[PDB]
Amino acid sequence: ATCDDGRTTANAACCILFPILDDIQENLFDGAQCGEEVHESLRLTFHDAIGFSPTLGGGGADGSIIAFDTIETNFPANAGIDEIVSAQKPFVAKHNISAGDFIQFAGAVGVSNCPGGVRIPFFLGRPDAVAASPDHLVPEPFDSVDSILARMGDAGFSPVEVVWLLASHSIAAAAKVDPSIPGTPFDSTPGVFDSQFFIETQLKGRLFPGTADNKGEAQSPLQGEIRLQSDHLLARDPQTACEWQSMVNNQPKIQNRFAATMSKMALLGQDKTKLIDCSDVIPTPPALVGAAHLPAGFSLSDVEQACAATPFPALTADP
Ligand code: HEM
Ligand SMILES: C[As](C)(=O)[O-]
Ligand SMILES: C[As](C)(=O)[O-]
Ligand SMILES: [Ca+2]
Ligand SMILES: [Ca+2]
Ligand SMILES: [Fe+3]
Ligand SMILES: [Fe+3]
Ligand SMILES: [Zn+2]
Ligand SMILES: [Zn+2]
Ligand SMILES: [Zn+2]
Ligand SMILES: [Zn+2]
Ligand SMILES: [Zn+2]
Ligand SMILES: [Zn+2]
Numbered sequence: 001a002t003c004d005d006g007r008t009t010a011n012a013a014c015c016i017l018f019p020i021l022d023d024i025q026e027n028l029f030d031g032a033q034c035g036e037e038v039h040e041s042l043r044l045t046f047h048d049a050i051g052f053s054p055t056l057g058g059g060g061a062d063g064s065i066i067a068f069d070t071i072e073t074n075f076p077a078n079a080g081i082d083e084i085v086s087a088q089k090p091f092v093a094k095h096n097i098s099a100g101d102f103i104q105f106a107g108a109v110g111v112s113n114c115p116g117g118v119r120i121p122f123f124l125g126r127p128d129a130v131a132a133s134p135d136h137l138v139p140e141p142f143d144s145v146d147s148i149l150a151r152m153g154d155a156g157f158s159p160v161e162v163v164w165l166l167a168s169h170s171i172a173a174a175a176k177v178d179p180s181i182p183g184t185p186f187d188s189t190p191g192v193f194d195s196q197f198f199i200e201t202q203l204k205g206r207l208f209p210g211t212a213d214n215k216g217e218a219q220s221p222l223q224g225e226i227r228l229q230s231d232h233l234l235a236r237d238p239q240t241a242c243e244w245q246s247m248v249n250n251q252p253k254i255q256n257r258f259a260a261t262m263s264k265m266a267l268l269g270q271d272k273t274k275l276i277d278c279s280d281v282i283p284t285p286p287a288l289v290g291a292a293h294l295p296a297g298f299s300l301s302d303v304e305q306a307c308a309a310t311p312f313p314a315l316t317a318d319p
Pocket of ligand 9: 036
């Protein structure tokens with residue numbers, strides 16, 4: 001199918017997305033950059049979608065965090081989310097797609113801006129949200145691995161899938177964990193969808209990059225990087241640590257698993273056969289610049305190995 005400006009897509013219904021794409025690349029993502037708003041928009045897909053529990057309710061990836069922002073953005077686990085929800089609201093008001101559709105679309109478009117990144121499958125047609133998420137559905141960085149895996153499993157995700165999803169922290173910062181240093185990234189290449197995150201979370205902690213007593217925070221190996229206590233445990237806990245380590249310098253696996261599991265999350269509370277596949281509207285991501293490596297001054301003796309069965313992979317380091 002050919003749309004009114006000459007761009008082509010497999011399903012004609014997908015044509016309405018092209019102007020939205022143009023609008024968000026320029027005005028949400030600063031000219032199709034992999035920056036702050038991509039990071040925030042990706043976080044948003046998860047905070048929207050994970051509001052889904054057979055026992056307590058929530059319609060999953062349904063736009064509820066926008067439609068019902070007054071309730072949802074005041075949940076403690078949604079700290080700092082109101083800023084991206086306010087940025088996105090006017091695009092949803094202006095255009096003719098549902099909030100739920102817009103959140104997943106914006107997420108997928110954003111990630112496609114990041115070198116190393118993937119084109120997350122995208123379906124159009126979600127209806128407007130009909131309920132707010134309950135509170136206590138979003139994992140918090142001071143939660144146990146047991147608690148996190150139980151929460152995620154309740155939403156339909158296995159332990160390994162939680163690891164695959166946390167590839168997102170390769171392009172992510174925190175603002176509210178340590179509010180004296182807002183925007184401090186979880187790995188050293190927040191602009192690059194790579195395995196640096198999995199390497200640096202495995203390094204021995206050295207310092208607190210800001211203040212020293214924040215809930216949900218662990219020592220970082222690097223100034224200007226922040227480590228969540230949750231990432232610290234997941235990297236090291238026997239349930240997840242071998243999966244964790246397997247992502248390292250395994251870019252094809254990161255890409256393949258993140259895209260698959262992101263498509264699964266984006267579809268939570270939704271029916272794929274009721275939606276139209278518009279995946280081909282998402283841009284082609286650039287290729288990885290870099291192989292992932294140890295930061296300068298580090299060696300392999302800096303790695304806390306936690307996988308019993310497999311020795312951490314050899315790695316290059318800067319001089
Ligand atoms: C598995 C349990 C998870 C925990 C405990 C967790 C925790 C956190 C925390 C505490 C922040 C920082 C918020 C702030 O203070 O500004 C954050 C940021 C972020 N989260 Fe995770 N998260 C988890 C899973 C996920 C998932 C599955 C995704 C997938 C989309 C996601 C994507 C992101 C992104 C992209 C950011 C960066 C936001 C920004 O730079 O503004 N998180 N996460
Ligand atoms: C039960 As909870 C996801 O608020 O630790
Ligand atoms: C704030 As809680 C006890 O649900 O992790
Ligand atoms: Ca939701
Ligand atoms: Ca990165
Ligand atoms: Fe509102
Ligand atoms: Fe380097
Ligand atoms: Zn910006
Ligand atoms: Zn921001
Ligand atoms: Zn429009
Ligand atoms: Zn809670
Ligand atoms: Zn909790
Ligand atoms: Zn455990």
